Amino acid sequence: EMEKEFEQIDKSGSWAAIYQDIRHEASDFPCRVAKLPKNKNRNRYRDVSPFDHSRIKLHQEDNDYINASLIKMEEAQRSYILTQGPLPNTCGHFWEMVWEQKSRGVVMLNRVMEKGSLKCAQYWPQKEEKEMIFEDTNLKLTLISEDIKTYYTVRQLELENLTTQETREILHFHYTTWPDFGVPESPASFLNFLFKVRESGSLSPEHGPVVVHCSAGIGRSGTFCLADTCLLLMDKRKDPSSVDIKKVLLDMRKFRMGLIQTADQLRFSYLAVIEGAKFIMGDSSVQDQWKELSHED
Numbered sequence: 001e002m003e004k005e006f007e008q009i010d011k012s013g014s015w016a017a018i019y020q021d022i023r024h025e026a027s028d029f030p031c032r033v034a035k036l037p038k039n040k041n042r043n044r045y046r047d048v049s050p051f052d053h054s055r056i057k058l059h060q061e062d063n064d065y066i067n068a069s070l071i072k073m074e075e076a077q078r079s080y081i082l083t084q085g086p087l088p089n090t091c092g093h094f095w096e097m098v099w100e101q102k103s104r105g106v107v108m109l110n111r112v113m114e115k116g117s118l119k120c121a122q123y124w125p126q127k128e129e130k131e132m133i134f135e136d137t138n139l140k141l142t143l144i145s146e147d148i149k150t151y152y153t154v155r156q157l158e159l160e161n162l163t164t165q166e167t168r169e170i171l172h173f174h175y176t177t178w179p180d181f182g183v184p185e186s187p188a189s190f191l192n193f194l195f196k197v198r199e200s201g202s203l204s205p206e207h208g209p210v211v212v213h214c215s216a217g218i219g220r221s222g223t224f225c226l227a228d229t230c231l232l233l234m235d236k237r238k239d240p241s242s243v244d245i246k247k248v249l250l251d252m253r254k255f256r257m258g259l260i261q262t263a264d265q266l267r268f269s270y271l272a273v274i275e276g277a278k279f280i281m282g283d284s285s286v287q288d289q290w291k292e293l294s295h296e297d
């Protein structure tokens with residue numbers, strides 16, 4: 001079990017070296033388009049880029065570049081798009097991505113402001129009466145409503161492709177108390193948020209991949225995707241002991257660099273997957289306990 005692994009790791013206390021090891025083994029593939037001079041103002045961090053092979057291409061003639069990747073989990077049969085927090089010049093690209101890729105959900109794990117700094121553009125309308133038009137990629141976006149909980153909010157957004165006037169509804173799941181380079185307050189509130197995204201239908205192979213972002217699209221997003229895929233993998237077979245957590249993080253880092261930013265986020269992933277296995281293994285009663293524990297209202 002991952003659970004025995006956990007206990008070994010904790011008792012020796014070697015999370016850092018374990019994480020060190022993941023970092024040393026992770027793949028390294030080129031990011032030449034991300035590094036082209038034209039794309040400088042499209043990347044938020046110099047040292048966080050999409051790999052060329054897995055990047056998302058915009059369906060524009062101009063410049064198809066966005067800092068986003070498709071994480072395509074073959075065995076689990078689930079994909080996500082991981083991306084950075086949109087910059088002020090790329091919010092139009094971000095929604096073009098959502099449109100072209102046919103996503104139904106956007107999972108945001110950061111606040112706009114963190115640690116004194118602007119981690120992300122305000123890329124969605126905070127009120128119904130004030131829509132956003134993105135003239136560059138010709139899209140319009142309206143808040144339809146939202147559902148504010150103590151640690152998270154769910155918005156319903158209407159996205160319109162102005163050119164054809166086709167519209168779609170996007171669900172936005174905003175986790176607002178997961179610290180940059182930190183962990184959730186607990187596995188319970190993490191799982192509570194994750195199962196809310198799952199319940200909503202957005203992960204569900206009739207839609208495009210869910211878009212997951214934090215500020216860089218690697219630390220908080222990798223943690224979220226790692227726990228989700230681990231639980232999925234375990235569901236298809238009903239076999240916890242077939243899931244190798246480190247190795248699934250390593251399959252994911254084939255598609256985007258840097259997924260999971262610290263050893264305690266790695267450690268939090270084992271906690272999350274070990275708690276969530278109770279639900280996958282057929283005690284659905286823990287779901288309701290997570291919700292209590294989480295203090296959602």
Ligand SMILES: O=C(O)C(=O)Nc1sc2c(c1C(=O)O)CCOC2
Pocket residue numbers: 045047048110119180181214215216217218219220221261
């Ligand atoms: O938002 C996250 O969870 C995340 O991965 N962020 C990251 S990863 C990363 C940075 C940041 C940041 O927010 O400043 C700054 C550059 O180094 C790597």
